Subunit: 237 residues, 4 copies
Amino acid sequence: ADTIVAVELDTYPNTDIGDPSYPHIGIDIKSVRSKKTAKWNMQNGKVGTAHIIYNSVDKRLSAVVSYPNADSATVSYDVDLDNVLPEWVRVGLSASTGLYKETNTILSWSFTSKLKSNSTHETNALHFMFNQFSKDQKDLILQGDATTGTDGNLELTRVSSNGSPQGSSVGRALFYAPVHIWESSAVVASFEATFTFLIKSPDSHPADGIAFFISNIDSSIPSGSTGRLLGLFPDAN
Amino acid sequence: ADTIVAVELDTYPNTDIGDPSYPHIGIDIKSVRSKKTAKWNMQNGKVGTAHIIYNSVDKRLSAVVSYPNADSATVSYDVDLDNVLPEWVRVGLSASTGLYKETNTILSWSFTSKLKSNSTHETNALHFMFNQFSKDQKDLILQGDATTGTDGNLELTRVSSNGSPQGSSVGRALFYAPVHIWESSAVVASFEATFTFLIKSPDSHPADGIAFFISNIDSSIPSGSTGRLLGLFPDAN
Amino acid sequence: ADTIVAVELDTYPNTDIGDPSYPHIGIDIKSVRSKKTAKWNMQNGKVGTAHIIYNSVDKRLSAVVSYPNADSATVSYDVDLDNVLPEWVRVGLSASTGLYKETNTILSWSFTSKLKSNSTHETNALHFMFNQFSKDQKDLILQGDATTGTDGNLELTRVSSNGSPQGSSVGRALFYAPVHIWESSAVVASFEATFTFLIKSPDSHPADGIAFFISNIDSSIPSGSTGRLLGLFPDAN
Amino acid sequence: ADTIVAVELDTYPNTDIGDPSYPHIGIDIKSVRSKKTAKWNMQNGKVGTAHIIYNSVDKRLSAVVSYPNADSATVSYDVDLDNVLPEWVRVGLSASTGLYKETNTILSWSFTSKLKSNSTHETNALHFMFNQFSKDQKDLILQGDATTGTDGNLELTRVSSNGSPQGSSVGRALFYAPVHIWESSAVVASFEATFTFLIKSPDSHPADGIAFFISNIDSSIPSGSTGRLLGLFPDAN
Ligand SMILES: CO[C@H]1O[C@H](CO)[C@@H](O)[C@H](O)[C@@H]1O
Ligand SMILES: CO[C@H]1O[C@H](CO)[C@@H](O)[C@H](O)[C@@H]1O
Ligand SMILES: [Ca+2]
Ligand SMILES: [Ca+2]
Ligand SMILES: [Ca+2]
Ligand SMILES: [Ca+2]
Ligand SMILES: [Mn+2]
Ligand SMILES: [Mn+2]
Ligand SMILES: [Mn+2]
Ligand SMILES: [Mn+2]
């Protein structure tokens, strides 16, 4: 199986599997059952922003999600990524819908990674910023129903030509190049991620959510991982 | 008086005011009596690196100092800078010598600051990087005995033409422009600082140390702040 | 007098001093009589973008102004800034109105400067990005009628509370810290500037324009430099 | 065949095919016969730096190579990359040796790319910086004799364990992710590349050289492209 570390923007409460009984953001370490969550007052139809940060000194993964003029939800968790992820990984965005749906539109996404090694100003860095997604985005690996082009945005889950979301959908987008997330002889390693999203739900409740994730290089969507599994996990264990 | 927050690379143990009995790095919040320290195996004559980081989500100030192929000293401390520093500040480097001395040479210094406000991708940033210091460095405010030019380096404390350090010296270098370190309506604020130094001590023990600090805009060297006071504090309270 | 190098977004044709007979962008070297201009199809009421670039290898100052889905105006000019500007300067934005007016609103502004000196990876850099202007913006020097705060934007020229522009107005905003624009022993020096603006003209013709400029550190608005002079030049020579 | 645009640091004069009769840097557009060259006083055994720049406004490709305290060679050439390369490409470094040899060691390599599209602050960027090359560098595609690890450096051509260069060698290193070098609806596109190298020649004359290149995504070393062809071209046409 794959190794996943993720920050979920969970819109649908699947209390049977651990979700609190309200929209929330959480930190998932190899399991859809978040190690820690925070209430999130999701706003249907409004553009929002997520900020994820981490550094090997504090060994603390934190995320902040917010909407213009509104309280922001925050969540942090102590975790040493050296003990969880392989040295090389791929970063990406994932979303899904089940019985209930929503649009999982990504307007922009940026990522920065730095590795300071045992030497004088010897830093390795990787940075990419997407504000516009073209039809043939060769530096993105699209999996499942994810597509680009429609208004220059990234649609993680399927959306009909009229613009309405589809249920039972799952999509992901990973940056093409592998990222060196940590190293034995690293003095300091850190990364920062940001993305703006538009979750619009016409029907009853919105579902199922969007997630920023880090995984093994050769990761792919687990079968039947639509709905509650957010296109990240094979089961709800 | 001034408001100081500093990370000190203390080379001389003044146990009579709280210093551990050995070279150490510490975090000073308005007092030379560190709120927290960590043992530092300073290496006479070798070039070292310091990394200081902070973000408003974790409200945790951390620092890492190291030398090539050698264990690195680390220290962290929970502190909300909103409650301690004014909204606008100046950032700088400080050093001193007392009865015993050392060179407090700075080979490079970089700083990055970011403020994410309540809006879509509305970030304000400031970044500067010095690898070479010229004789007439107009974007630096030099105080006390600090000078630039000698090999394109920054000498915080006085050094004779032959190259030997002087005792009873105090110097500082602050970036010219004020930095917006935090704001009431900020979603995320963070800064990162790095500098490489060369502490060389000919005589007995090395003293007194170097420090990265943040202060009120109009800060200047307190009288008699040579020695143990590191050019930052008026007294040892 | 001051030494000015500027890229003007000239909205009012002052043909008797050399302006082409239509809105244009031009490059001014110590004179409001542009060394080179390009027709600019200015769009009243719409937000636009300006990009200014320069590097010491090509010794070529270029600018591009554009609006979403619209042709963009471009202008370039060969000029070695070493022979025109002092080694240290300040960068800023300037605007004015005369008999006719317009709003000269700045929504964001970023600047990057790099100096590569005679050494291994010895680069000095300066970077700032403003997307939000606060009421007490301490890192900006405001001159004339320039103010910040109204929607978090920068108003270069006077605007009444109801939102209508005033005539006979002149304003400027300069970054606080001096910028090292070039150095005798520099291998490569370069800068890049970007700002989005909103020029709205209720009355007859729009006037007078906005400009990005580089000047001697102690520059201030020349008396009577409203109107055609764009708050940059003492006269029309 | 492949589409190549390259800046060559040519150490061996193959006057038979157009080379000036001395070391030189040149700009190659789909042919080893440089469209333009500049004399280069290459220095055996010393670490040097190369800076390549380009922007779609001036449509000018420039390069600067230099050594500490020494004159630097410069070369520029007007060329619209839109008319020569695919929209998507890969960037890399190439080197070779023939009868005569040299080490083609890369100490560091950084690259920055930006695409400003028809919208408000809608920039796409890619940036990577290598100062240390590890044994298993997964984000680099190594072709031919290129290897990493030896002192954390990148050896483009073969080097015996004792440290001496081999003749008849060819190697390349390309960044893993495709780069979006230009787009029909782009307001401004630009890139910047930098790398420090160490060319050491024990024998007679040094040969054959190093080159920074941009090519179609699926590019590979042309057969028999050792020596004068710098691992870039199939023949000397
Ligand atoms: C012996 O005490 C003196 O010297 C030490 C070391 O230099 C300083 O810390 C102190 O303030 C005094 O000046
Ligand atoms: C003498 O000719 C050979 O050597 C030179 C220099 O090494 C190469 O340029 C050439 O292609 C051949 O291999
Ligand atoms: Ca759920
Ligand atoms: Ca002490
Ligand atoms: Ca005019
Ligand atoms: Ca040759
Ligand atoms: Mn959940
Ligand atoms: Mn101490
Ligand atoms: Mn004009
Ligand atoms: Mn050649």
